[PDB]
Amino acid sequence: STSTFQTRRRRLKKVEEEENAATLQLGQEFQLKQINHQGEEEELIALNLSEARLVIKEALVERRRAFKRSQKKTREKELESIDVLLEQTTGGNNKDLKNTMQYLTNFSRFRDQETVGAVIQLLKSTGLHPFEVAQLGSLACDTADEAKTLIPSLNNKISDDELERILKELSNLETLY
Amino acid sequence: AGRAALYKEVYNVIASDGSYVNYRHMALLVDVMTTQGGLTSVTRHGFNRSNTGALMRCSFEETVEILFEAGASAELDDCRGVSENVILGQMAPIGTGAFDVMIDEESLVKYM
Amino acid sequence: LRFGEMERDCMIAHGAASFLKERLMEASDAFRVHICGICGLMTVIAKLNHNQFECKGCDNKIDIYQIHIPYAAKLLFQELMAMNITPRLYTDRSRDF
Amino acid sequence: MFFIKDLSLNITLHPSFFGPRMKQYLKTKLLEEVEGSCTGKFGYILCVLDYDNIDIQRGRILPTDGSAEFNVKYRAVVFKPFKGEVVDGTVVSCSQHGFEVQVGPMKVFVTKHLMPQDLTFNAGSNPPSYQSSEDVITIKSRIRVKIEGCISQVSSIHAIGSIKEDYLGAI
Amino acid sequence: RLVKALEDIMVHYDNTTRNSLGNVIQFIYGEDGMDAAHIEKQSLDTIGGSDAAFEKRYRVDLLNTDHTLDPSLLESGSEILGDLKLQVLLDEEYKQLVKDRKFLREVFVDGEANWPLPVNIRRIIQNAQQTFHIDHTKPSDLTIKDIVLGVKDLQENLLVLRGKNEIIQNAQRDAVTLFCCLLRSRLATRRVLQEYRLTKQAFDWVLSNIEAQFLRSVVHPGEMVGVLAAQSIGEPATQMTLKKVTSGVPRLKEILNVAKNMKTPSLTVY
Amino acid sequence: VGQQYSSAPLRTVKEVQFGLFSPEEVRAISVAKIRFPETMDETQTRAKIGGLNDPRLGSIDRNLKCQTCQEGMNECPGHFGHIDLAKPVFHVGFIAKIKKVCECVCMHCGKLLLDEHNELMRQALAIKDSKKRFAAIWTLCKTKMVCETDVPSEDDPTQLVSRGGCGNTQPTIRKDGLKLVGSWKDEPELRVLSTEEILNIFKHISVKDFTSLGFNEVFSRPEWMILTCLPVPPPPVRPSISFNESQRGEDDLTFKLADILKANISLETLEHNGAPHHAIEEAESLLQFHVATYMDNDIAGQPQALQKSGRPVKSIRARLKGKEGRIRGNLMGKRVDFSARTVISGDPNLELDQVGVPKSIAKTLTYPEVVTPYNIDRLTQLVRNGPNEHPGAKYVIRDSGDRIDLRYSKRAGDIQLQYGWKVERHIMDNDPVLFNRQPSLHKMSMMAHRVKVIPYSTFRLNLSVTSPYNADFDGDEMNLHVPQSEETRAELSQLCAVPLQIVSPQSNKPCMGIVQDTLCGIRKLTLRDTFIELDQVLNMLYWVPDWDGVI
Amino acid sequence: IFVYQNNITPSAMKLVPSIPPATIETFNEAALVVNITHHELVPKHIRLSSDEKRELLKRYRLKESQLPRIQRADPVALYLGLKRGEVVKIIRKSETSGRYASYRICM
Amino acid sequence: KAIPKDQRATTPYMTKYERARILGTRALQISMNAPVFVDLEGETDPLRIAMKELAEKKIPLVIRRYLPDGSFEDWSVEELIVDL
DNA sequence: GTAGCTGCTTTATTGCAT
RNA sequence: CGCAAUAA
DNA sequence: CAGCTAC
Ligand SMILES: [Mg+2]
Ligand SMILES: [Zn+2]
Ligand SMILES: [Zn+2]
Ligand SMILES: [Zn+2]
């Protein structure tokens, strides 16, 4: 198993375990208020597809680098470029991350660490409890309704027109393929 | 001044016999009894009823009774006591185990 | 042979920690039991084969530690339980100090 | 939806590996156990970010046999679905009871009952399928579902999703 | 009983004596922080003896032809006589050796001068003696300033409690104090040069050892004193096979119990 | 040490939380209902009935089963069960307190008889100490027997302020056997306080009132001192003793429960059947008995409830009672392995720290050494050497937690050792050992000696090391303990080695010295009058091992 | 302070703690014929400021309890008139090293 | 908390237990085929080796001195003076 | 002023009986 | 299991 | 049978 910087004290009675509903009722282990290694308080880290593909790709690569500093002593085109970085710095028995990079690489809504840069700076100016932010990002939407429905937590956190503009700005930055 | 006498006596006792004991000991004991407040008998009536752990006081005279009212008063034991670990099978925080040991990765490379 | 109290005392005086613990354990009882990380108990229906761990009533399969203590210990406890007293076993202190 | 949670892990190392390239074997094994894991409270553990700055701190020695216990503090990326969570993925298998769509490392399944009625299960189809008046759903066909419920099993989380509400079909 | 009564009492790394509650029982184990095994009966000469004889022995007068160190002892003998800046230390010293006299006679009302004390300063010298084949004839080579100062230094190092603040450092002085007297007793200018002729070398050696040997005689945080001391008493308690006052085994019992009506009551009024 | 790899993590106990069982937790935990009294015999058919004994609990007959939990016998700790009493019964040991509590709270309502309104009471509610608080509390409100509704506040004795109601009088309670009775006071009105009644009054006691009176909201609720559900310890706490096959062996406790059970069933079959009302309370007092005894059988109200044979019956309390019992008996001091004992006899030929161990024993005791390229040879020799020649060994254990028995294994003269393998070998000369002579009342009672294998059956220790053991040879014996882990011996050899104990930290003086012969002789050898000539002064020099070779 | 001769009334005394801040003590005449402090056996003690005390404490990494105590009615205790909290430093002689610093909080 | 490698008060020398233990601990590991940090000049005994590793202060271990309050200090075999 | 309570040195060795 | 011995 | 707390 594995632990987490968050020593919740067990008082014999193991009962209060809510339920998970996209009513921003994420299991305690994901409050918009979690603890950083430095013992610091840090906002929940919601990662939206494609913005994830980069986080992985990058760290997954840079690993390959320090995995060799110790050796002296295009859509379907990235499918192949990833199978590489994988069968080099992964385990291979981690068949998931293989599947995750597939899905992640495929349904990605971007490409640039710049595009995904402004994407973030954009959504990041609402006050939306990180899980929303991520959703509005990795989900293709048209009306403010498609959103307010597939992302029910919203509802009263923005005037349709706004979430509309923001929804438009997305159908743009949204790099081609 | 009480201590003084308590010690004075304990001393004169081991002394009338000829035998020699070094202050420190009788002193320590004479103290253990003295600190707390007044006189604390080295008996189930005295010391073995003070705020020490439960399991400890448990291994001496009142045992079961002591235990019974341990869970009765939801007591908590530090397992700081000698006896404590002994009962548990762990290294007691005593001499050899009054501290920890660690492989310091660093020095473990500076050495080669 | 027996390593009764008298003998213990001596070792505790010597400071021979490990050794003492070793006489008490390896050369005697020494048993490995499981616990509900929550209600400090023996319950844990451990199947050390399929890994499954449960402890329903507390309902788990997640927070479970295994500990090494004397068989005369598991016993001391079970006996207290049969007399209806909860001897909780916690793998980490909280009360601090 | 996908998160980056800060975890730790206590691995016991045998005195054997108390070499110079220890810091390494610690890491190395961390990954052998973490990456690819799965818990109901952390969900799917996918990747350890920032390889070079993993904290090992001073590990202590377990009295009775050298074995040192280090508390590897770290950070990685994960994803564990939720109920009422909407995500889309590639369909995989399909049957008279529904079809299963693969959202990431996970797999969500849809019941013949959780979809619309004007969608029937085509039997004599190859490969198997479901058909609407204007639609056709099978294998590589991309859907977008609503995760109704989750069930954390072994080392793999599963869920059931519906495509009955609005805006939840093919694409 | 004494066992279970003091099991958990051990010396902590701070040099304090406590139990399973951290309850201080003795801030410095044995009011001195020394390991029993490193102690031998020494004698504080600076205490017993006539007022006359005392002065004789430890008094140094660089302003007198009959009370000055005869130049046959110190090498810089004659060139010292009269030296007023030196007689300031010689009087600064002799004044101390007397605060000592009064001090000891204020703790040991008795007059008993033989007590258990770490570091055998007695032998430590004897060794130095025949280790440098020093002859009771030739002159020294120690400035009066050499001696009196190196002594004042020796002290500074006999660290029992280490601490970095006031309170603590204060304890240091406390915990040591007595040993010192003994030290200043066996290391007075006269004694050093007249009684045991020491070269500058011999001295620097004796000094060094007194230290390093002292620092060994400290207690080791980890010593389960309680149990130790516990046994140390109930040991010669078994060897008891038995002025007409309740004494011996029953007596001890009577005590450890905190019993009301003790067989013998007595009460000595002076 | 318990065999079988456990994937679960591994920690050491840090805290011990003492509490009382909730009549529901008991259920939660329980894996067996336990309704039948009988041991089993599914119609004499040897096995077990879902009644008592493995109605799922642990098992016997060397059979894995244990509700799939497998493991069988060694490895499967106990599996608790329970049993539903008909009516509430006290707790033989808590009776003392359940009483003292009622005198502090009122029946009918359930609140204290002393509010922060009374001042002597406040001071009590201030004394932080779960025991001393509940000590003073009781001392105070055991007097007032009127659960008042109004009292003169912290203002004027002219303005009687209000609080909880019901001022009903409270009976002074007294103990009788296993029940509480109290008079309500023209003239007395004595009545028996029914457990069902007390139980309730307690349940309705304030949550913050619990607290004030040395109790805990989560671990020890007063309302728990009264037993509803009964935890039924599994086999290994009350093991059988089956003689071969068709013979019994049931433990003492296993009967007490059996009793408790029977006595219980009788009650229920009277409450849902011919219930002569108070001819039933005449049988409810029986359950309060057995379940009293099952835990404690050394009360004041004599009736010992002897098992048919006038034999007492060991209550659980009796199993823990000091000396010879679990705590002081099996935990504070156990019997050990790797230990020997014989007759000690002096010998002026072994340096202080040595200790002669008879070859007989060097072959009995062993030391587990780990195959290392530093001795991969020395061991293969011992291993093949067999366990009969002296320098040998008797066991080789491989990584695969399996032991080869060097004296039968059709491979004795074989075996290629594997780096990491453990080869238990014979004690050889110079293995540190803890050698001592009881009664051990000195730190010096036990010490570490260098082992020296020697013929003839006796521990042959040096003389000078004799007075610290308080020993002599008028037929005295001694104990010898063989260390086991590398780090172990290290502790003996570095802190326990005889050469160390030489100066006693209880008299700041040596505790060993020269005695007897060597003493009496070192005097005659001294004397001005004593002279020795060449031949001798030569042999004598030779005897001193460290002779510089300079006549 | 109030030096009663043979006694005070159980009615009287019941008004000593009724006017705080200010506090009052009662001493028997005969009980003060000789000073106990003067006794060969008794070492002089001393009070501590809420500074010196809060110091001592922090300097030994101690909690309040862990400290050795002296009875509220202890002979010496009243001589200096302590308070459930104040600390006394006892400096006495020692056959192991001249002096020895020891403290006693008051209960 | 912890405590800075500076400001520590504990004895600069190794307790007889620390040493006694250190050796044991190391020996134990040595005996378990751990890495050897000195030239086993013929030496084939662990606790023998340890005494050697420890005399060239080439032991990679750290003693964690705890205090009656919980706070602790950290010393390395290297640092600690081995007088005894 | 009367009543109720808990402990008794350490190991070991043997006979015993139901 | 309880008794009785007996060693030092 | 104390020696001492509890009633
Ligand atoms: Mg004898
Ligand atoms: Zn549980
Ligand atoms: Zn089982
Ligand atoms: Zn009421």
Side-chain angles (χ1 to χ4, degrees), chain G residues 1-21:
Chain G
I1 304 170
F2 204 54
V3 185
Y4 64 85
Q5 284 193 54
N6 273 200
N7 73 292
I8 297 178
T9 307
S11 309
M13 300 177 263
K14 295 247 176 180
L15 286 141
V16 181
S18 73
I19 67 173

Side-chain angles (χ1 to χ4, degrees), chain A residues 78-110:
Chain A
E78 195 179 70
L79 277 193
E80 220 197 78
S81 83
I82 271 188
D83 298 358
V84 169
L85 178 59
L86 280 186
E87 301 182 307
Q88 309 223 304
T89 52
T90 310
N93 47 193
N94 191 309
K95 60 78 63 180
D96 295 304
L97 185 30
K98 198 178 183 181
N99 275 300
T100 319
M101 290 314 278
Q102 230 182 61
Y103 174 101
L104 229 183
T105 203
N106 286 302
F107 303 67
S108 274
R109 198 180 196 189
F110 307 77

Side-chain angles (χ1 to χ4, degrees), chain H residues 8-61:
Chain H
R8 323 126 74 194
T10 69
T11 291
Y13 308 84
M14 190 174 279
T15 75
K16 47 188 173 187
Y17 306 66
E18 295 183 307
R19 109 126 209 171
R21 187 178 174 182
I22 306 180
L23 289 142
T25 298
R26 194 82 192 81
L28 178 37
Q29 310 180 292
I30 297 181
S31 59
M32 289 194 263
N33 294 296
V36 227
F37 305 123
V38 186
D39 276 285
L40 317 68
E41 283 172 44
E43 290 300 354
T44 77
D45 176 296
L47 154 53
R48 203 75 181 53
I49 288 196
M51 289 198 284
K52 169 152 236 222
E53 303 205 318
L54 167 144
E56 285 174 45
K57 274 179 189 161
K58 277 196 159 196
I59 286 183
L61 281 282

Side-chain angles (χ1 to χ4, degrees), chain A residues 2 30 34 37 47 63 103, chain D residues 2 5 8 35 73 88:
Chain A
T2 355
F30 298 97
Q34 62 170 338
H37 117 285
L47 217 199
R63 180 192 289 185
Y103 174 101
Chain D
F2 273 40
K5 199 64 180 173
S8 72
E35 302 213 326
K73 174 62 223 301
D88 33 11

Side-chain angles (χ1 to χ4, degrees), chain A residues 2-3 20 22 29-30 34 36-37 44-45 47 60 63 66 94 97 99 103 131 135 139 145-146, chain D residues 1-5 7-8 35 42 46-48 52 73 75 80 83-84 86 88 90 102 104 144 167:
Chain A
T2 355
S3 176
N20 311 294
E29 206 81 76
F30 298 97
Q34 62 170 338
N36 185 63
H37 117 285
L44 191 313
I45 298 306
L47 217 199
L60 216 300
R63 180 192 289 185
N94 191 309
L97 185 30
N99 275 300
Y103 174 101
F131 181 53
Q135 288 298 286
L139 285 186
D145 218 322
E146 180 151 40
Chain D
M1 195 304 103
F2 273 40
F3 306 65
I4 299 183
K5 199 64 180 173
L7 345 173
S8 72
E35 302 213 326
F42 294 73
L46 296 168
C47 191
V48 202
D52 283 307
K73 174 62 223 301
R75 174 182 292 208
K80 65 291 166 180
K83 312 186 178 183
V86 186
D88 33 11
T90 306
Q102 187 152 306
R144 156 171 289 185
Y167 314 72

Side-chain angles (χ1 to χ4, degrees), chain E residues 53-229:
Chain E
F54 175 82
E55 184 178 61
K56 172 163 189 170
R57 199 173 179 191
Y58 304 64
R59 178 51 135 170
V60 174
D61 195 322
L62 296 180
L63 313 184
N64 185 185
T65 328
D66 307 298
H67 283 18
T68 230
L69 328 179
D70 185 289
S72 61
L73 314 186
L74 171 46
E75 194 170 63
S76 48
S78 63
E79 83 156 299
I80 290 190
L81 206 179
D83 195 317
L84 276 171
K85 296 193 171 183
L86 289 195
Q87 261 297 293
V88 186
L89 300 186
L90 281 298
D91 288 320
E92 185 203 306
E93 165 178 289
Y94 187 110
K95 242 183 185 183
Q96 182 63 58
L97 288 176
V98 178
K99 175 186 290 183
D100 278 46
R101 193 80 179 301
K102 305 301 99 82
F103 191 138
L104 311 190
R105 288 184 166 192
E106 202 186 67
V107 184
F108 299 49
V109 194
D110 206 302
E112 196 56 58
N114 306 292
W115 303 81
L117 275 189
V119 162
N120 186 338
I121 282 177
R122 170 169 173 53
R123 287 184 295 84
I124 204 172
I125 270 194
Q126 293 172 63
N127 299 315
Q129 294 273 286
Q130 71 163 71
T131 288
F132 304 65
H133 301 308
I134 281 183
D135 61 310
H136 299 286
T137 76
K138 291 194 177 185
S140 170
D141 57 329
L142 304 162
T143 314
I144 308 179
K145 203 172 178 181
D146 276 331
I147 288 191
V148 180
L149 267 173
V151 169
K152 194 154 186 177
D153 272 288
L154 180 57
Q155 308 206 192
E156 300 305 277
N157 292 289
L158 322 187
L159 268 104
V160 171
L161 251 168
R162 222 148 288 282
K164 199 92 178 181
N165 82 67
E166 183 70 309
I167 299 183
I168 297 286
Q169 280 291 314
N170 256 318
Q172 170 68 54
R173 300 184 186 72
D174 293 288
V176 183
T177 324
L178 177 36
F179 175 56
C180 312
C181 316
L182 166 60
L183 187 37
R184 301 171 203 148
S185 174
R186 317 296 199 66
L187 284 182
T189 307
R190 261 290 166 64
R191 231 167 173 290
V192 180
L193 298 120
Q194 211 172 191
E195 300 182 59
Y196 22 76
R197 303 275 210 305
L198 290 220
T199 73
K200 154 81 173 183
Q201 190 178 57
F203 196 86
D204 275 299
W205 188 72
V206 192
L207 284 188
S208 166
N209 290 295
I210 287 187
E211 165 176 47
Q213 215 163 67
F214 180 90
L215 287 171
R216 296 226 192 71
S217 295
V218 183
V219 172
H220 286 252
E223 276 283 297
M224 294 295 321
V225 189
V227 171
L228 192 312

